[PDB]
């Protein structure tokens, strides 16, 4: 507001928008100028402060006013980061007078902060499809029986001594007296999936799907692999395969499509042929011979009893990736005709993989999160990268997976559990992902937010996957007490917030389930057309987003955070729109006052919120919306 020896927090703003960053993703010649926002008139100098890799130290560049936005409010002030390979950090030092402010990747702070600082990784590049689309992740076997000459019949065959019990569509997907959980089965598979991608990539309108294992392998999850090289009968062969992969790429069926598959490469089933222990292959594999030539492929403690696990479990026996240039290391990604190259080259092409239990990974029986792990993604990535520059690669990780993508040589994303998935649940149904009681406020949930944004650079950022559920925790329907209004806002929020927007399978109508197995359910498809408020909104939501890349790639700006009225306002924008995103987690309805100024969304201009049509006016700063509880209006412009 002025020169009076105080910087006024409000005013200040930068991320790596459109708006505030030249070059978000750039090459080791590439400059990147930076623009800090100021209310106009407010501060007398400010810089840029950042750690270049290079040398192991602070540099300075003092920032020059470059302009005032459209309405006048604000000072934009820019300084430039020279181009070179080095990853480098940087955070801004705000002064007005006598008052010194800074600002990084966690918003102002009155004092010197020594971490969330914003990142710049030269080379380092996210598929931009990813970014910008929406992805539906499905469980094989649950989703669709589309051809039931292949369905897995109750004793069709054993598995440890227990037969395989076959389910009729609909009902619990617990095992009876005599069977295992893990050998049940509904008849879901690849040919459903492809008569079901109408639904998909139309009646939704997503562009991504996203497999749980679909390779040979007795359970019905599949991660306890027989064979990577073949499809899992029982979901179809790998001709199958391509006609689905060639469906999903379709553009006559809808929206260009994309295919990621499961890779769980940490650890094999027991009854692979590499390891064999029930002998269900002439081969001799590890447990049956330590003369075996996969021998070295695992880890024996005590042969061939007791050796290296997936969290204890004897049926995921640990693979062991040695040194680089190892057997393992070669039938996984470095060889050809490896696991992850086979896939990803004709007549396949798929266009990424889902790194599961990639937090394991290591050698010679040990549990990851060391250096060795991660020497290993980075060869992963020159691998993958090489055969296909723009094949995702999402690491799983319940926590911060800084380790695995803040250096642009691992992956380009990962499971956002703590970004995503436990802020969304605690904010909104009060439980956290395993239906355990955990609440938070607006505030609290957009400080959590921002956070663990901020644990990111901001092409990962892009690319996390953010999903209301997963196969691993307990259904939002449940942790929402069967309340669909909680789920309608859950969608509107997960359809605006910045990451790969994930639908688990049965989320977008409101299904049910509690903890493994009961999350992995048949699909209702009686429920799944637009007759369903919940599916009419999805369909909405993503329609809503594919038509502006604010949402997926602009700046994200917190507008409204009150606890008394439990309102959550923010703001998408870019170069070309303003968004104005309004949210209502009480359980009563409220007048908002969007303070839309904020965005310089100019006053006299109109604003629609693209989820009933109704059209606003901007004056004196400010948009006056209703919104009932549990639910939200998207402003734009
Ligand atoms: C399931 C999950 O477990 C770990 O995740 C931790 C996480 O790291 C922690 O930070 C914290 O948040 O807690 C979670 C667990 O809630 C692990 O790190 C993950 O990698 C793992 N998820 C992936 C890996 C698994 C192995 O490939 C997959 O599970 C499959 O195999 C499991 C082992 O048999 C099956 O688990 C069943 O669990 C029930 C318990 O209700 C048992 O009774 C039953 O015997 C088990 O079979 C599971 O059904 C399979 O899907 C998992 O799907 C991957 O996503
Ligand atoms: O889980 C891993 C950790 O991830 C997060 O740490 C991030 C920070 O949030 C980022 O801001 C950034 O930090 C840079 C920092 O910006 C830069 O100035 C420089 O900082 C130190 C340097 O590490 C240290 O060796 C010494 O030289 O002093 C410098 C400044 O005084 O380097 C930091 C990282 O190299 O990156 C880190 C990690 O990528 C999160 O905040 C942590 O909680 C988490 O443990
Ligand atoms: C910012 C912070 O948000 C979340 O933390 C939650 C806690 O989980 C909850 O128990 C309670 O304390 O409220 C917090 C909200 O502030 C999130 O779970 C954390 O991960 C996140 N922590 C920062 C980000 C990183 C990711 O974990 C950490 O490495 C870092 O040390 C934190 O500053
Ligand atoms: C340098 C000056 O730039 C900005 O001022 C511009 C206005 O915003 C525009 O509307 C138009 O009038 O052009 C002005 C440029 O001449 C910015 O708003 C100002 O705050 C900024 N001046 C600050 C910096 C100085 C250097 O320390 C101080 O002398 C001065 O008091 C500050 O206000
Ligand atoms: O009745 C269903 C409806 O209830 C709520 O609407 C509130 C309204 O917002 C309050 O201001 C007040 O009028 O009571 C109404 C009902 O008691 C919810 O906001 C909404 O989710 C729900 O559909
Ligand atoms: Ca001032
Ligand atoms: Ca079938
Ligand atoms: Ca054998």
Avoid: C
């Avoid at 590439?30 to 100098?45: C, E, H």
């Avoid at 703001?571 to 070309?576: E, S, Y």
């Avoid at 309004?582 to 310089?600: E, I």
């Avoid at 629609?608 to 049509?613: E, L, P």
């Amino acid at each position: 507001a002025a020169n009076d020896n105080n910087v006024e927090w409000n005013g200040l703003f930068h991320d790596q928008g459109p708006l505030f960053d030249n070059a978000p993703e750039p090459t080791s010649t590439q400059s990147v100028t930076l623009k800090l926002r100021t209310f106009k008139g407010d501060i007398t100098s400010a810089n840029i402060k950042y750690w270049d890799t290079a040398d192991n130290a602070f540099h300075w560049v003092p920032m020059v006013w470059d302009s005032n936005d459209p309405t006048g409010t604000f000072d934009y002030w820019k300084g430039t980061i020279p181009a070179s390979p080095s990853i480098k950090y940087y955070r801004f030092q705000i002064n007005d007078g006598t008052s010194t402010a800074w600002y990084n990747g966690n918003g102002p702070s009155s004092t010197e902060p020594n971490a969330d600082d914003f990142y710049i990784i030269p080379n380092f590049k996210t598929p931009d499809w990813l970014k910008n689309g929406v992805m539906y992740q499905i469980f094989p076997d649950r989703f669709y029986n589309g051809d039931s000459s292949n369905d897995v019949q109750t004793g069709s065959y054993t598995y440890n001594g227990t037969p395989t019990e076959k389910k009729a569509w609909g009902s619990s997907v617990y095992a009876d007296p005599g069977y295992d959980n893990s050998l049940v089965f509904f008849g879901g598979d690849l040919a459903g999936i492809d008569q079901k991608l109408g639904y998909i990539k139309k009646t939704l309108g997503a562009n991504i799907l996203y497999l749980n294992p679909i390779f040979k392998a007795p359970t019905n999850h599949k991660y306890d692999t027989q064979d990577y090289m073949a499809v899992d009968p029982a979901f179809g062969d790998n001709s199958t395969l391509q006609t689905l992969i060639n469906d999903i790429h379709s553009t006559a069926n809808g929206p260009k499509g994309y295919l990621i598959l499961d890779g769980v490469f940490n650890h094999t089933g027991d009854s692979h042929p590499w390891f064999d222990k029930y002998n269900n292959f002439s081969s001799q594999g590890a447990y049956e011979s330590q003369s075996s030539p996969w021998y070295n492929y695992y880890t024996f403690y005590t042969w061939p009893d007791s050796y290296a696990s997936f969290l204890g479990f004897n049926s995921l026996p640990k693979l062991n990736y040695g040194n680089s240039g190892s057997a393992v290391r070669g039938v996984i990604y470095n060889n050809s005709n490896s696991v992850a190259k086979t896939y990803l080259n004709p007549p396949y092409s798929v266009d990424g993989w889902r790194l599961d239990a990639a937090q394991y990974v290591d050698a010679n029986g040990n549990n990851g999160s060391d250096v060795t792990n991660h020497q290993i993604w980075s060869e992963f990535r020159n691998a993958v990268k090489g055969v296909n520059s723009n094949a995702a690669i999402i690491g799983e990780y319940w926590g911060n997976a800084n380790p695995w993508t803040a250096q642009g040589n691992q992956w380009d994303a990962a499971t956002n559990f703590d970004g995503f998935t436990q802020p969304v649940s605690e904010w909104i149904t009060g439980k956290d992902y395993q239906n355990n009681s955990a609440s938070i406020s607006t505030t609290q949930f957009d400080s959590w937010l921002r956070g663990t944004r901020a644990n990111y650079p901001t092409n990962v950022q892009q690319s996390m996957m953010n999903f209301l559920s997963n196969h691993d925790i307990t259904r939002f329907a449940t942790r929402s007490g069967g309340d669909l209004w909680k789920t309608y806002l859950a969608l509107i929020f997960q359809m605006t917030y910045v990451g790969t927007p994930t639908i688990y399978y049965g989320d977008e109508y409101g299904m049910q389930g509690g903890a493994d197995p009961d999350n992995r359910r048949s699909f209702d498809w009686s429920q799944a057309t637009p007759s369903n408020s919940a599916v009419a909104l999805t369909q909405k939501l993503i329609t809503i987003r594919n038509q502006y890349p604010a949402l997926r790639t602009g700046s994200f700006m917190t507008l409204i955070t009150d606890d008394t009225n439990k309102i959550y306002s923010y703001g998408r924008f870019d170069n070309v729109n303003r968004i104005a995103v309004v949210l209502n987690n009480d359980s009563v309805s409220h007048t908002v006052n969007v303070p839309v100024w904020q965005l310089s969304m100019p006053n006299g201009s109109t604003v629609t919120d693209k989820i009933t049509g109704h059209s606003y006016t901007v004056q004196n700063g400010m948009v006056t919306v209703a919104v009932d509880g549990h639910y939200g209006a998207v402003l734009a412009q």
